[PDB]
Design a protein around this ligand. Structure first.
Ligand SMILES: Nc1nc2c(c(=O)[nH]1)N[C@H]1C(S)=C(S)[C@@H](COP(=O)(O)OP(=O)(O)OC[C@H]3O[C@@H](n4cnc5c(=O)[nH]c(N)nc54)[C@H](O)[C@@H]3O)O[C@H]1N2
Ligand SMILES: Nc1nc2c(c(=O)[nH]1)N[C@H]1C(S)=C(S)[C@@H](COP(=O)(O)OP(=O)(O)OC[C@H]3O[C@@H](n4cnc5c(=O)[nH]c(N)nc54)[C@H](O)[C@@H]3O)O[C@H]1N2
Ligand code: F3S
Ligand code: FES
Ligand SMILES: [Mo]
Lengths: 134, 823
């Protein structure tokens, strides 16, 4: 019957509450899947919000799943386990590292009428799951 | 779909697979099951034994969609595959590099990254590529070899052939190809995939009595100090660095050192990099160990010999050597002290390394510890010195330092190659007494036929532009001569081609997985099979032999390289028998092989046995104790060569470390010191430096494997590295009005090539680093022809100018130019 996973729609916050380059922690699509949204401050392809610069990612390293940290100075996610680094400005492109998958992108809907940011899906397979939706 | 994977069923077939790619030889499992079956999420209902009913914790698994595929066998049935690292393998403990992790993706499928695999013989019929039969290919190829042997002798038949392990090498394939080239054809006109004569990377260390793979990976766990010399191991030997070096730096192995040596001090482990360039490995070492536990000796390019002679002279002056060891187990020490004398002030002026850093290097590495023992200093080296300024002289200098300080044969030591590919060499002796620079011979118009066999020197030769220009020109003469032919027999066409090769032509054959850039010149391409489409044996950087098990069919009529060699030898034998030449026919006996196992039995397992011909084998005379069934039982842990013993009760028993009794591979069983003259840069290279602004350093990127033969079809790799990149100092970039994603021309007297600019704060003003061997902007065009006494090129030894072409707006849109040095 269905070919798509049943992704929740999860409110993150309103776009205007986000500060430039200050990460917001949230879970998606369940409480075991930690994510980050960041207003990058300059447009990127597939950024959303008034300035087309809001992106979000699963922070679990796609190599072996250690939680990555967001580095505000480089706008990258850095893995402390085997030093993989992912570009938040290039859809999770691996700059250098041992992963074989770009950091999964959390798809955000920006609703102009409400200013609301909603997580509605994931592009790529989150670490340590048979399917994004358990 | 990108958001799920199909789990292997609990009862899925599982086979062993060593990584196709680097020296480390990480252990993998291959799960194979019917496409329409899947495992359940409960741990006892899938083959991984992992609980997918909830989030897995960190480090539980390495699993991504790139690690899965669906293959279609010759019977048309479809199977899931999953290729994942083996948690219980001692080499990698479940680690996978970005390069081995792609193995499932780079298995042959009609629709995936392997779609363009060679599937049939391909013939350039003067003016178009067409398919041809194996019997027609063999009639042409063997016809031309036979005509050349009959008129010119073996000197008319040229090869450039792998001599390595892993995929596109290993014990079966080096034997098949070596028996064919050396026993059967008997041609001395043979170069190796990575060097343009039939030679060794390690003549000096071997001659001094120290085979270059003399320790175990465990020795990196036991060291007090690790030197990494001309080596970027996070990128190029990832899981050796990650699974053995870092645990030492982190203090996770201190309790193992103390258990083994109860009465010895073990300070926190330290690490020393000899590299002109500040690399990802230096950055990661500093991150893990701290700046106070890392010494980056950022030497002037080509000054390794001066560094090692200074350190040698200093440890002798300090008495930080092992005099009893020198007296009992060495020859030539007093001579080496005289010939290699160099003060620290001279050493600093030549290398540019300050005296205080030279002293500190020696104090960490050689000065006795409080408990009285010398530090256990493991000296690891790779292409920065193997392709450095006089390969023979740098090993001479470094081994002198290592021998004097007893850093061979003690646990936690060794003076070892880090390695490139895996190793898997079994061959008859090279059949001449002469070192021959094969590229120069081809450029000068020698040879009737040239076969590239599992290599692509269009992308990887030194002075590559002179080579490609000559081969395309000599190829075109053959193509032009083939044009006049109408309804020609194979015999006639063999004569037409030979005549063209008398008029400066060259017939070109490539034996390969893919067309490659070679197809720009080749007249004939034959399809080969990689590990998993065949059984294969090889050993890693600690001599650990493993069997990679066949689990699928090759594409079309693709064949194991040893069986292609058998096919060629049997075609020639049949031609000589038919032509009434029983003595020439007999040269081509001994290739009655139905499977790659037959080449394993004929070569590796006959070395040193009664009745066997002369055989040079990394397995030695106990190679016969190894069989496929015994390696299967060993699993991905295999055995470290040489094998000491086999019985049913204990399996294969191996050798952890060489030289532990101070008996070296020399006439007198002593290690031999060598003179190491400091002559400066080779004149050829110094002429480029005097004329041009930038040092054109070159080598590996962690993500890109070799000539990108698989990666060129990988959408993720092409997004990330659409073009070869050149790391440039930012101040140099400003002066050239270039930034990330601009294209430059790089050029000097030897050639001209192109790269995308990658500003890197860590690069020194006047220095650069360009990705080698790539499919878009070949670095080797600007490398010189200069080689050492044994024809080893100074690939890392060249200078050129940089000219802006322009802004490539799509690179700026799509490619990260962010730092690859982890802070
Ligand atoms: N400037 C510069 N040049 C260099 C270097 C350097 O540092 N700087 N490095 C040198 C070194 S260390 C090396 S190793 C060389 C590498 O130079 P090459 O050996 O030319 O390059 P590879 O990519 O290893 O070549 C492997 C080839 O074999 C094919 N292949 C893969 N598997 C198989 C198989 O099972 N059978 C067959 N028949 N073909 C197969 C691949 O498609 C590919 O075309 O380049 C050298 N060149
Ligand atoms: N990711 C990845 N890994 C690989 C491969 C691959 O293609 N990709 N290929 C494999 C093979 S075949 C090989 S040979 C190995 C190579 O492994 P390495 O030899 O570690 O790698 P390279 O990048 O060729 O060069 C090593 C270092 O030499 C330094 N160097 C340059 N000139 C000098 C010099 O004059 N002196 C000294 N001391 N250092 C110098 C460079 O700055 C560079 O960081 O990697 C293997 N592993
Ligand atoms: S996964 Fe492969 S590329 Fe080297 S580090 Fe391990 S053998
Ligand atoms: S878990 Fe992130 S680099 Fe390995
Ligand atoms: Mo290599």
């Amino acid at each position: 019957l269905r070919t798509t996973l049943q992704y929740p729609a999860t409110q993150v916050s309103v776009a205007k509450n986000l500060k430039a380059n200050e990460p917001v922690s949230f879970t998606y699509p369940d409480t075991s899947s930690p994510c980050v949204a960041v207003k990058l401050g300059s447009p990127v392809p597939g950024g959303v919000g008034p300035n087309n610069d809001i992106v979000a990612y699963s922070v679990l390293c796609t190599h072996m799943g250690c939680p990555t940290s967001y580095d505000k100075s480089s706008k990258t996610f850095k893995c402390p386990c085997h030093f993989t680094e992912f570009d938040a400005e290039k859809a999770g492109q691996m700059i250098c590292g041992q992963a074989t998958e770009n950091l999964p992108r959390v798809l955000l809907r920006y609703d102009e009428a409400s200013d609301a940011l909603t997580a509605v899906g994931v592009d790529g397979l989150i670490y340590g799951r048979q399917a994004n939706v358990i | 779909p990108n958001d799920r994977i199909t789990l292997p069923p609990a009862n899925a077939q599982r086979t062993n697979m060593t990584c196709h790619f680097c020296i480390v030889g990480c252990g993998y499992h291959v799960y194979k099951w019917p496409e329409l079956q899947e495992g359940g999420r409960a741990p006892e209902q899938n083959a991984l034994g992992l609980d997918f009913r909830k989030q897995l914790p960190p480090l539980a698994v390495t699993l991504t969609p790139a690690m899965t595929n669906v293959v279609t066998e010759h019977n048309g049935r479809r199977y899931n595959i999953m290729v994942v690292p083996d948690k219980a393998c001692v080499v990698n403990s479940g680690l996978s590099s970005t390069r081995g992790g792609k193995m499932a993706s780079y298995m042959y499928t009609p629709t995936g990254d392997g779609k363009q695999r060679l599937k049939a013989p391909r013939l350039y019929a003067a003016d178009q590529w067409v398919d041809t039969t194996w019997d027609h290919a063999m009639a042409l190829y063997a016809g031309l070899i036979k005509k050349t042997l009959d008129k010119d002798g073996p000197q008319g038949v040229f090869f450039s052939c792998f001599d390595h392990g892993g995929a596109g090498g290993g014990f079966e394939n080096t034997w098949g190809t070596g028996k064919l080239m050396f026993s059967a054809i008997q041609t001395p006109m043979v170069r190796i995939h990575n060097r343009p004569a039939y030679n060794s990377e390690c003549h000096a260390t071997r001659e001094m009595g120290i085979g270059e793979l003399n320790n175990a990976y465990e020795d990196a766990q036991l060291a007090d100090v690790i030197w990494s010399i001309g080596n970027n191991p996070y990128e190029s030997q990832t899981n050796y660095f990650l699974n053995h070096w870092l645990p030492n730096l982190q203090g996770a192995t201190t309790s193992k050192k103390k258990e083994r040596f109860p009465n010895e001090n073990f300070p926190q482990a330290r690490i020393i990099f000899v590299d002109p360039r500040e690399t990802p490995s230096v950055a990661i070492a500093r991150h893990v160990a701290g700046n106070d536990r890392v010494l980056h000796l950022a030497i002037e390019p080509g000054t390794d010999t001066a560094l090692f002679n200074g350190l040698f002279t200093y440890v002798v002056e300090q008495g930080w050597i092992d005099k009893p060891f020198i007296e009992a187990h060495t020859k030539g020490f007093d001579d080496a002290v005289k010939t290699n004398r160099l003060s620290l002030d001279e050493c600093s002026n030549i290398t540019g390394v300050p005296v205080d850093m030279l002293k500190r290097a020696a104090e960490w590495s050689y000065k006795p510890k409080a408990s009285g023992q010398a530090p256990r200093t493991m000296h690891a080296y790779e292409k920065g010195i193997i392709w450095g300024n006089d390969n023979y002289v740098i090993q001479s200098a470094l081994l002198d330092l290592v021998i004097a300080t007893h850093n061979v044969g003690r646990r936690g030591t060794g003076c070892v190659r880090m390695g490139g590919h895996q190793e898997g060499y079994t061959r008859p002796p090279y059949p001449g007494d002469k070192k021959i620079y094969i590229d120069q011979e081809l450029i000068k118009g020698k040879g009737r036929i040239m076969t590239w066999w599992g290599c692509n020197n269009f992308q990887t030769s030194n002075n590559a532009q002179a080579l490609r220009e000559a081969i395309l020109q000599r190829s075109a003469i053959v193509k032009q001569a083939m044009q006049k032919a109408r309804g020609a027999t194979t015999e006639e066409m063999v004569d037409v081609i030979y005549e063209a090769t008398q008029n400066g032509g060259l017939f070109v054959t490539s034996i390969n997985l893919y067309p490659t850039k070679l197809a720009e010149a080749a007249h004939l391409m034959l399809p080969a099979a990689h590990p998993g489409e065949m059984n294969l044996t090889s050993m890693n950087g600690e001599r650990r032999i493993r069997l990679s098990e066949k689990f699928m069919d090759p594409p079309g009529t693709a064949m194991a390289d040893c069986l292609i060699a058998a096919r060629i030898a049997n075609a020639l034998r049949d031609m000589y028998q038919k032509d009434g030449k029983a003595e020439m026919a007999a040269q081509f006996e001994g290739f009655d092989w139905k499977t790659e196992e037959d080449a394993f039995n004929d070569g590796f397992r006959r070395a040193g046995q009664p009745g066997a011909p002369a055989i040079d084998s990394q397995g030695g005379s106990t190679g016969h104790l190894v069989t496929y069934d015994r390696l299967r039982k060993s699993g991905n842990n295999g055995v470290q060569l040489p094998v000491v013993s086999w019985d049913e009760s204990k399996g294969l028993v191996g050798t952890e470390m060489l030289y532990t009794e101070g008996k070296f591979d020399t006439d007198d069983g002593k290690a031999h010191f060598k003179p190491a003259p400091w002559n400066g840069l080779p004149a050829t290279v110094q002429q480029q430096k005097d004329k041009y602004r930038f040092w054109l350093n070159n080598g590996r990127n962690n993500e890109v494997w070799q000539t990108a033969y698989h990666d060129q079809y990988n959408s993720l790799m092409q997004e990330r590295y659409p073009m070869a990149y050149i790391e440039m100092n930012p101040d140099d970039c400003k002066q050239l009005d270039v930034t990330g994603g601009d294209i430059v021309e790089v050029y000097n007297d030897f050639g001209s090539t192109f790269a995308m600019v990658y500003p890197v704060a860590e690069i020194k003003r006047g220095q650069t680093f360009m990705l080698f061997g790539y499919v878009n902007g070949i670095q080797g065009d600007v490398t010189t022809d200069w080689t050492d006494r044994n024809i080893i090129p100074y690939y890392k030894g060249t200078w050129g100018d940089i000219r802006k072409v322009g802004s490539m707006e799509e690179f700026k849109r799509t490619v990260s130019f962010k730092s690859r040095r982890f802070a």
